[PDB]
Ligand binder design. Structure first.
Ligand SMILES: C#CCN(Cc1ccc2[nH]c(N)nc(=O)c2c1)c1ccc(C(=O)N[C@@H](CCC(=O)O)C(=O)O)cc1
Ligand SMILES: C#CCN(Cc1ccc2[nH]c(N)nc(=O)c2c1)c1ccc(C(=O)N[C@@H](CCC(=O)O)C(=O)O)cc1
Ligand SMILES: *c1cc(=O)[nH]c(=O)n1[C@H]1C[C@H](O)[C@@H](COP(=O)(O)O)O1
Ligand SMILES: *c1cc(=O)[nH]c(=O)n1[C@H]1C[C@H](O)[C@@H](COP(=O)(O)O)O1
Lengths: 264, 264
């Protein structure tokens, strides 16, 4: 996508070389924002082929309030294998925080249910937010939440959403994150009888790992193709009742996939 | 300021009329980001007179982990009066979360200290974050946190900070918010022997109240003057040891003030 490629070029041209936790090294910039009008099409990168199966199943896994990769394995998803323990658990990550944020007094908060009820009963609210950044449980998580906090918005019957990603791997993670959230927006909109609006992505440490330079340069020469369209085959009883078989990506003609190692 | 005035013009040009909690009515846009190079000068609005007295005392109050307005009162600052109860309490708001975020296992995390330790020992970390958005205690707060999340970054020996403000009252609150955080960066930088970098402001529901339109247009007809200079006269033992007297703002020649009502 245009916005995406522009960010890549920006990182290359303005990035500062930074030594990081993985000891790999990165070209890094701080503070960036991009908007995706969802009416124009599903923001799925076409400059390289993206794997929808992994994107969809992970999101359904989140809404389940699940933190064990068992589910992902049943569906041949391995994106979280490098961080799961001997038993497949990742600690109280995303899923746990979304569906059952632990209060100091022992109670639990279902942020998704709250959001649904807010969108349905009080759309003008400026407090429709879901946070995965539970300071009190960060030590128990296998990896700190990258896409840590998001806010919904409603105007003229359209549902928008802004995501704050504290850390971003432009080449590997960013394409996955965009599509994942854009998908959530569509699911929320359908469940709340609202049209889709804009997906606003805001990031903190936006970077490109040194060992991805060639891949990036290759992708930057490929002209972006028209954006695909998402089709939701069925309207479930609730936001928690979606199945992988309910989504269709029409008109997705991407360029060949580009391989690159992951940093652990 | 240029960025500030341009934001106001954007809200007016692309804002949607929207009803709100206070029952006042607002013009609103969702998603915005602007950057302030702190080396250029202290980002204090000159198109209208602002009063440091309240900005500084509030920040010091925050750092103390204080949530009762008694302190503010002793120093003749009334900005928070309308939301405090009979005992002057506001609930576990900013100060409390910053200095003692409650964990489910009985612990309390001092986010400010954690950040200081990170800036010195691991400045390349992509997790240097302070969050006031405590989902589990929002119900005990007098008002949900507007400026609820911020991340620090270091590059070229300069300290930058990005703030995510979920809700923003462009005319009243923003001028305070910008100066408050720019001040925090200066204090942090001095304590970590770093230079000041950029303050990146990101907003969710950025709006202007219907009853602030004339004030807004009056301000827009003014030419921004040179930015003031911040002079810290002392280097305290810790970030929690600063006093009002330690700060000196010079070169501040602002336009006349423009009074406007606060939405409760
Ligand atoms: C974001 C996010 C979720 N995640 C989780 C996640 C967790 C830690 C991380 N750590 C680092 N350094 N970078 C990441 O992008 C990253 C991503 C992802 C995990 C793997 C792939 C990945 O390797 N992509 C392959 C396809 C693999 C497959 O489908 O089997 C690709 O080349 O596209 C992408 C995203
Ligand atoms: C941000 C922040 C902190 N806050 C707290 C705070 C709490 C609730 C809010 N509610 C609304 N609707 N808008 C706000 O900006 C807002 C701000 C502020 C509160 C009041 C003033 C204010 O009254 N401004 C007057 C000066 C009054 C004085 O000197 O005491 C002005 O004319 O500017 C500024 C900031
Ligand atoms: C985390 C998970 C995700 O969905 N998307 C991402 O981009 N990431 C990345 C960010 C960074 O590349 C790597 C490590 O982050 P950190 O060292 O813990 O700060 O994961
Ligand atoms: C809150 C506190 C501050 O620092 N600055 C701000 O702009 N605000 C504003 C946001 C909004 O106008 C009002 C809070 O109302 P709500 O919770 O968003 O409904 O104060």
């Amino acid at each position: 996508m245009k916005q995406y490629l522009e960010l890549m070029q920006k990182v290359l041209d303005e990035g500062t070389q930074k030594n990081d936790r993985t000891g790999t090294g990165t070209l890094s910039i701080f503070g960036h924002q991009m908007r995706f009008n969802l009416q124009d099409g599903f923001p799925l990168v076409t400059t390289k082929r993206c794997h929808l199966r992994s994107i969809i199943h992970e999101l359904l896994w989140f809404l389940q309030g699940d933190t064990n990769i068992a589910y992902l394995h049943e569906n041949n998803v391995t994106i979280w294998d490098e961080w799961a323990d001997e038993n497949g658990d990742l600690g109280p990550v995303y899923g746990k925080q979304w569906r059952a944020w632990p209060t100091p007094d022992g109670r639990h908060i279902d942020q998704i249910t709250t959001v649904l009820n807010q969108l349905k009963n009080d759309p003008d609210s400026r407090r429709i937010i879901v946070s995965a950044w539970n300071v009190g449980e960060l030590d128990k998580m296998a990896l700190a939440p990258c896409h840590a906090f998001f806010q919904f918005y409603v105007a003229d019957g359209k549902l928008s959403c802004q995501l704050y990603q504290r850390s971003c791997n432009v080449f590997l993670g960013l394409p996955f994150n965009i599509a994942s959230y854009a998908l959530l927006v569509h699911m929320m909109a359908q469940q709340c009888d609202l049209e889709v609006g804009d997906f606003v992505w805001t990031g903190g440490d936006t970077h490109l790992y040194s060992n991805h330079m060639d891949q990036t340069h290759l992708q930057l020469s490929r002209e972006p193709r028209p954006l695909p369209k998402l089709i939701i085959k069925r309207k479930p009883e609730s936001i928690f009742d979606y199945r992988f078989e309910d989504f269709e990506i029409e008109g997705y003609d991407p360029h060949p996939g580009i391989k690159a190692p992951v940093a652990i």
